[PDB]
Structures are given as C-alpha cells and as structure tokens.
Amino acid sequence: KVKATLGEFDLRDYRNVEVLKRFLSETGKILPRRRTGLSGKEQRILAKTIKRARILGLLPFTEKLVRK
Amino acid sequence: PITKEEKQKVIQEFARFPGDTGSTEVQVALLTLRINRLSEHLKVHKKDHHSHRGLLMMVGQRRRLLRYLQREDPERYRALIEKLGIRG
C-alpha cells in the first residue's frame, strides 16, 4: 500500500508532486482506495488535491501504456 | 455573511441584562437579521429556490415568536416591533 510505504505528508499541499505521483497509476488515473491505503475522509481529499495539481500541469491527466 | 463582530453587536443592542444570550427579543431581532440578509440576497439569484425555503422557515419562526409576545406581555411586543420595524 502507498500510505504504509511513505511518511508524514500534507494531504492538502497540491504542489508536492514527489508525493502525489505515488497516488497515480501507470496511467494518469487515480488509485482506488484499495491501493492508496487511505480512509474515507483521506481519499476524499486526495481526490480534490490531485484534481488541482493536474490543472497547474504538475500531475498528468492521463498516461500511455508501458511494459514491452 | 454575518460576522461575530456584527452579530454580538446585534445582541448587545437588544438584550435584557448584559450577560444574556437567549430571550425572545434577541431571537427575533436575530432572525430578522438573517432574514434581511436573505432578502437582499434573493433580490438577486431569483433562481435560488432552495434558500428561499430557509427563508420562509425563518419567517415562520419569527412570527411564531411574535405571536407569543402578543400573548405574554404586549408592552414588549409593541415596543419590539418599533425597535425592529415590522408590522408597525
């Protein structure tokens, strides 16, 4: 899980890309709660947060496929 | 929106005895505030049908108290409307 392999970080700091990146998939998509390892309230916020970081082009909106 | 600053001012202006927070006069005066603010807000956003309910609600509540006043001591009622300016 991503919460377990990571430390103390602000859920609201929409700039910190070095962190958020771990919350997106191999594609641009946002990890599901099963992955992130977050809570009900926690995820709700990460949603809003990335949705922001995206806009200031710090986080993608979508990626392409890799392995091959 | 209404602020602590402004609000408290409103209470002070109306209370019975300095350290009082809830009493008819107060309660009334108060809504009245909120209402008026809604009023001014509904002149615009004529399309905000929702809050307009909270408005009726507020209005009902207000009247519910006045009718009580007209019940207990009229003296207060008579005086209170003038001080607020309603069904004078």
Binding site: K3, D10, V17, E42, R52, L56, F61 | -
Partner: protein, 101 residues
Amino acid sequence: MRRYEVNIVLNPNLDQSQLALEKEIIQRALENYGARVEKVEELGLRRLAYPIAKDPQGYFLWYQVEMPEDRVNDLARELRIRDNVRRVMVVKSQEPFLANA
C-alpha cells in the same frame, strides 16, 4: 478578510528583464485590490506533466495574500490579461491536513 494562495504560472522562456517585468505588474496589481502579501515562494522552472500552450515547462509563483472577499474574483480577471501569464489559481488558505502520521 480571508487568507489565500495565489498560483501563478507564466512562460518559462522569459529573460531576466522580462520576468521581473511581469512580477512587477502582479505586485502593483495586488495592491490595487488590497492584497497584503504574507509571503511568497518562487519555485521557478518545473517540468509540466502536460504541455501548456505548446511549451513543456513553466515558471512558478505562489502568493499567500490576505485580500478583501468581494474582490477576489476580480483580482484574477486582471491577472489573467498578460499573454505571458498562462495559469492562475486562487485558493482559500486551509489548515494543512496531516496524513500517515
């Protein structure tokens, strides 16, 4: 009034003289709308996840201003005029919500 975070993003290909020009504007603009700055952070150039206006990079500014409510939307309208200033975002300053701690 309320605290805010003012995200501003402008052209990455700006020279010494030009950049400080745009910055200048912003500064004067803020005061025209009453926003006193509590502090600013200049991260500067960072690579964009996606290309903004055909250009893959951007210059980054941040501004914790404490301006008047009614005029926040406007503040931006004025800010969104320069053809060099490409992204703008004004946010309410929210108490940082800790996690995994």
